[model samples]
Target chain A: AFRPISVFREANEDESGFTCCAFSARERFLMLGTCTGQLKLYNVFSGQEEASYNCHNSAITHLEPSRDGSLLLTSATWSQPLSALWGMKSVFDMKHSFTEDHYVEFSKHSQDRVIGTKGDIAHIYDIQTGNKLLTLFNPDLANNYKRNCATFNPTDDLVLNDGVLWDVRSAQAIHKFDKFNMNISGVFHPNGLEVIINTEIWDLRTFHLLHTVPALDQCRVVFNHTGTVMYGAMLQKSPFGSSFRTFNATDYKPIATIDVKRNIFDLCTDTKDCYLAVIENQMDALNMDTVCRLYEV
Target chain B: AFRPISVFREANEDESGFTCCAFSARERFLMLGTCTGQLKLYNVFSGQEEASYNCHNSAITHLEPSRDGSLLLTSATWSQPLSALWGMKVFDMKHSFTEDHYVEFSKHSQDRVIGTKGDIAHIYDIQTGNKLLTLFNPDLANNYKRNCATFNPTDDLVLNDGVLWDVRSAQAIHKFDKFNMNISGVFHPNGLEVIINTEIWDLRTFHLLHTVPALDQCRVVFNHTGTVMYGAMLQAKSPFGSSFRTFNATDYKPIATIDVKRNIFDLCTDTKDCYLAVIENQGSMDTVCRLYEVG
Candidate 1:
């Protein structure tokens, strides 16, 4: 009923393939990555190790940790494009590098920020001079679409770009949607007014287009510190199974579903039960063994 | 426009995360699992990667593969003392696997498995792990939890007050006509009828065969050529006036309400509806699987 203290992973070692992971806002260091570009570091309380960089040449997968850990960008594409940027005591490098293979985040609140996309462009960089700085277009967006994803709005310098939202130092694009459909990702809603695009329901106060609902193409939305409910998932999901599709930023309807490990009464059952086994979250991940479970009905 | 032919993964370098899935019998291979208890292997036509094992520190979650992909069965359960199973590479607590909590499987075959813990529905045996049956009612289990059993096409039967059980000669097998809550049923690809929850029954006489004013807990669907039948209702926690309804898989009327996705735990419309697959589990949370191109 109370176990998720975490720190103890040696099931597959250095062949320790990850694509991304982070933890050091003060949980005390725990970074791991793998796209075959390893970047280890531990000690989130006794798991020891503390450092291990190799930083590039293929699969670094994903990472982004800053704010009290100094900085650690490190990203990866499905296979090649490795990224860099680190520092706990030196391990920093990334001169603008990060071309096609895509994905990288950083923005613990802002300033040396970061973001990328490739297949329709999307740039925006500056992990202390990783350069570039802004490209996000979608005005006529759609003629070979291709943008796996792009983001940077944790607190608002605004730059979402899958359906376009850019305000990058005022580089323009204040909200552009309506390429008809297939943009696939858009979040923004820490009270900023509402923007769940890619399952529909837009409304940046008056952009109106409320409700086409149905997400997943690299989706990710979560807003429950109180913003009238939101949580959508599909960007790589499965951190031991993901399913956060709650809704209602006003009308994208659908609700209730929570899983770090079960508790989905899902409106009292039907349609294959929707996964609602209900109850089991004392902080989940009790260190191993459970590929499927559902009871508490 | 049905492009989703491959996404089988279990070895993206095994940082482990698949939790539960099974498909190797002519779906051509996809075995997933990893609750810390490995079981990878994929090849669902070229997403590549194939093979690995470490099978159980505890989260393969539970799988049941075997229709010809040469046998496999995995399982795990833990919220605290709750569930195991591993099959063929051997290890049997009857094939080590967990079920019961929110478990449900046996959508008409793959060797059956229908979970339920408090009001009992059970019926299991993904190849010898065995339970064989439970289908309870004991006056609906000491009078508390609302009985919700499912599985039609008669895998030995089970459903509730709207009866229908034949659990090895304990017999009831047909009672149709009742609902004020908790009745759950689905199977009308002509298995003599049954749509429950919005009414439609006749699985061998007991004919009501039609009704859809739908009151609560609604998720009826039929599309893979059952022609058409979709009902929505199930937006609980408040507010409703239409909430995405649809019908007519051969006479349940209604036809098209659409303005949907409110608390709906699941809803579909395919078989030429081309796309509709929704699953909102509840308002502003996760239990989702969206799509809506049936324009």
Candidate 2:
């Protein structure tokens, strides 16, 4: 159950507002990306700046930590091109110029790989050496139409574009789902059997529609460590609080909806699912309202 | 009292470094000129780059903001004689002044001053584009390679190198020969002292107040309130290492030194004296701009 939320912090006197954040695997530390291209580390409960690094000269757009929390990936794309990998202890290991990428993410299954996607192409890079491993693109989708979102499957065998699932090894499209209402993103279920695209869950084995969840349209969804519960978050309009609608993953039944009066952009939970962190949307340049709220479950 | 705040650079870029910079009058915006002849504007408080413009074809050598911050003038040296004015509502005009290498607007008038090496410096009426005054010194070197001119705070005196002139009469007033040759000076905000390089001269007595024995041939600037002074100098750490030293304006005492480890092309301050901008050239062609917060 979600109790009354507690505000962890706001913009600091010397802070330039945060763009993105990530938690360590064990939830022992928190890392934040600043608009000024700085990566800051803070202890989970201590709430102090333990260390900081100058990763880029522009605003940082993405921050993703490895599964074991030993390495980190940071990217920026405001005035220049930059994507860097850093050690958890402040060692800047390598960097790559991402002229074609607007966003980058660490692979869920392997720490050595990452994917940066923009427009019609997705680039896979080796995190350790700053080398491009593959450029995933389909000619049919190559007229430079925007796909805004891309990600690797939990199994790391398939990569999901907006509506097509491409096999990683063959570099070809395995299946293309129906163009249902301009899909924003598609995530493969943990079991690899189903994919939730926007609002509908599809059976990956047969490439058919399974079920459509209501009120979860266009919202990003996340599942707990056990894959037993799914949470869909949507940032709502003014006066209407944003909602985190939850559902039972096993039977596809509604669970509980948690509403908070703030523009939430990202959500993450600890390994044990004891705490959930809601990251605020950077609505303005100042981002003085940027906040991170921690809730005990 | 200053602290290192933030740095601005284009990552993975290999062009020549930032060549010039200017802060707006209200301390709300900053304009940075690069070796690529690109002008980038940024929000001072939010630290977000807002817009950019391709102002010239070659490296931008100078950038000057108007007293009201409404107008901006930018120039290039590697290219042909060129200078352009920019602002809203006002007309955008480009003019070529022979042998002109530097340009600046007066403190309290619509007068524009141009400095040229081995040539006469000219004062022009911005609105009319007419030459208001022709400033030249007959007692000169065979090759005076540097010519810089500016008006004092009262808008009555003009200092071209070490020669001071009356702006109204176009007559030479006093020549501070001690600090003459390839140097520039700034009038004390109070209009009482004129600092020619490291030598400070009292206007009432025409006497040299003191000499700091510092970076004698480089550029210098006073904070908006004139309480602090900054001078570009050569850093002893490395060949390309350049630095800037700050001083308390009242007693001419040293405050602190900032080493940026690159060739400093220009130095300036915000109107509120809240920040200092140092433009430097990364080896070869890369450029880096550093901002320090003044407490």
Candidate 3:
């Protein structure tokens, strides 16, 4: 069930638009990107613009917190060629950065080891020294066309294309995970024995049916803390309404559906999947007040 | 013959992409509208950025220097109330010219001339912003915007339907015929002739002088002497090259055509009419004033 906790409010009287957001792991600072090229911060609990620092000359494109919860990585579009890593302390020092080009990454695996990714190049980086540790992928594996999330599935092997089971330790793929060529992407079970493919496919071990549902447009999909349910939603623009649905993994029956506002681009679940946070935007350029809602999962 | 003088050059580095330009009649300053939301002024004789002042926050869309050259009339694309005279700089601080729709102009007088879709064309005093005359006809139709209009030869007589009006009074003068759904119309520089669609009409006798076989979509400029005329080929943005054709004012016979680099948004002629100063635009942030000596 989804309930409104914080009614969407204006970030400021004069705002270009807000982009990326990061909740400081160390401090109570809830940093949000402002339209006028600023890293606006607030004490989320105090409800005030504690301070703002000029970050970019334009919109901030991406933001994520470091695994340790003490640093912030943010990127902007059309303004600069690089992203920055900022310290979460009072002064907010720039600890380190991977400024090679447009980048995205999976969070750290260990205290010393973290997975780093950029356009067509994903590797592991030594967080403290800012040196690359490992190349998880090269040109072929890291498809030049994608900007996605931090690591959710901790499998040492990446289940990428339908057939390839890319082993991280060794740069080459070990075995075939699929028997079809429908471009399969799936989530691994906690037990590592079963997999839920977005589309129906033959499994690697038993060569059995891997999926129960006929794959449709499940663009914004989320898996709850438990492995039994899959959440998916389809987004629309201003003129049309959007649809959200949940499905039972065992039999693949539609468990629930929700009619919602169009343009809900981001779907995220908190730790333990306690609640799902969705960012709803009308693409209303006139007023850049992006609405966000946290639904009880 | 089209001969190039010099590519319009700027002395400084940071320059706005020029949009529209005007040469002040009384002053030596040439004011240019830039994509960077500023009006840059330059010395007409020497190539230098004299100074620049603030303008629209967005790019200036259209700018017209008054016919008398006494003032500047600039229009921008995204201003509200499509007909609003938003960019027309009339006063110092407070100037928001609002019009119903873009109708027609007198070119000579700040005395406003606008034709609305209410089967009415009205004249307004530019100073007082008062309605001086209302030219309407029952048969003309409503919401059918009056397309083109101009004052012939002098400031006194204006035309709508051969339907003329008095500058001092809201009175109708004459009716030539029903109407001609001309593509577009413009008065000959001398005002002695009018080009309604393809045919040229004598403003004096309302006689059909000559017909134009081909005319481009937009932009027609006449030399101050009204002898040689030119047409500008315009595309919305990032125009590859602008092609201009010389036309004989007598019968719209196109003469030699000059093809130049990039953009040609606006053009101007000097007092002697010896050269046509073209407001040339470089891809995005620079405006080049290319001058071609006219014969």
Candidate 4:
């Protein structure tokens, strides 16, 4: 019954107003994606402009911060076949004299369709080396279309567990859990044991299909610090239809569902599973309206 | 044109999805707003949930850390009006809890509309006491909906600045700037100036102000540290369609304009002014935020 807060709104002076946004590792800064390939940052608390930079010659498709929180990675379709990384700390200090390096080549070929989700190829890169770490080109898994997103688990299992026995050296895959033939958009769990993909269909992937549920249309997935529970958005067709689902980590079954309307775009959960920040999608323009939806676990 | 990154379509079987988010003073940890009205802290670098606590009974509408990052303030619009404070260090560690203080405002305004704009508003300072500062007064600006509030970049100022400034302030006394119609929204630059639609007024003097010439139905204004102005979305009927504009402070001329199609609803600029992020409103509650480059 409660609604998020609307923080700011401005008239469109340029042909395009506002579109997408990414929060910095520290959460103190925000990078905004506009229709014109321009990326901007604002102080999250003060609402003051921090930095603005020209990203791609064309519209920027995605802006994400590296796991370490030091570098900013951006992807566009205009000129390059890859994504670029800018030093967050250095750029904030010396706005003019900072270096922006190409972190990853998103595509192997320079064709137009290759730059985005095309047939079945999904590209994965190392944030530090800018190397094409893995090329997942499963026509069967991809279902004739490229995967929309791919991410690596932040934790190194070796450091957390005893270095004596079996060391979990492999990087976990983070993608959406969708129906058998639908588009996937969920994140991989840090443990690499289970996966939650979103679509009209919901499935728990653990080597084999663990469980399949009716289509909830959830969009994002994230874990708590302890990795005991998972949180994500449930996209619905009607305004009063959407909801947020919380699942028990061990079983992968939804333990709680909070009813919500509107489409949720991005979400991040807190350590104790007590709160969450759900960013709702309201089309192309960005307003100060409460983009964040919080829930209690 | 580039396509948007696909929306996340999966749920983590083990993790709790996002419910709310509040950035720290330094923008480090994201404090999430939860359905249970709890405040959860997330470590941005590690991509892991860091901490959580039950701060309110219902849903938390806002979570703001103090300027010094010492204290945390959370407001919720539950069945009962409530707001609470938590020590940053103590809450982060999740140690023995201490109740600093709490305030229930629902008792005062019995007829208040629950979720309407400006329903229950409050402000607080870490250096000050733990008491919630009641920013809403039914007597003065009654029924004048408040969308948002921010502190004017200055500390010496007595009256609160930004769009939520009440009519009692000297800046609010100027009738010339006041329109006979109910003002939809307002944006104040980082300095002592504010821009509303075609009119740009000096915040210090509260003057009727001059027209910026280039800006039309301006929905949002973001001022970078350099003081360069970035405006988003001209009015629906304005000559220049939906777009963004950058105005140089030295000469109030627009440096550039980026054309986009969606009706822009909100915009937030970074400190460097090199990047601009926009959120568009698709009439049906579906909104998308896009990033742009400005030369």
Question: How well does each candidate superpose onto the true structure, as a TM-score?
Answer: 0.25, 0.46, 0.41, 0.37
| Candidates' RMSD to native | 22.7, 28.4, 29.6, 26.0
Model 1, global lDDT: 0.51
Model 3: residues with Cα > 4 Å off, grouped in runs:
A1-297, B9-16, B66-70, B81-95, B100-122, B134-138, B141-149, B159-183, B204-207, B233-241, B284-287
lDDT per model vs. reference: 0.51, 0.68, 0.53, 0.42
After superposition, which runs of candidate 2 have C-alpha atoms over 4 Å from their true positions? A4-6, A14-16, A77-79, A95-97, A141-147, A235-241, A281-287, B1-295
Q: Is the docking of candidate 3 incorrect, acceptable, medium or high quality?
A: incorrect
Clashes of each: 45, 4, 6, 132
lDDT of 1 by residue, B2-62 (tens): 2222233334433324555454545544455554666666564475656767756665444
Which candidate leads the pack in DockQ?
A: 1
Model 4 CA lDDT for position A77: 47
lDDT of 1 at A215: 55
TM-score: the better of candidates 1 and 3 = 3
**Off by more than 4 A, model 1:** A1-29, A32-40, A43-46, A52-71, A74-84, A87-113, A116-123, A126-129, A135-158, A161-200, A203-208, A212-297, B1-295
Model 1 preserves the real interface contacts to a fraction of 0.00
TM-score of 4: 0.37
Best-to-worst TM-score order? 2, 3, 4, 1
Interface RMSD of each: 20.2, 37.8, 41.0, 22.8
Residue A222 lDDT (model 3): 51
Provide fnat values for all models in the order shown: 0.00, 0.00, 0.00, 0.00
lDDT per residue as tens, model 3, A184-296? 24444432445554455345467477565654342335554333356766424221125667765334567777666445444554433344555555433345565545455
TM-score of 3: 0.41
Q: Model 1, B266: alpha-carbon shift in Å?
A: 37
Superposition error at B79 for model 1 (Å): 41
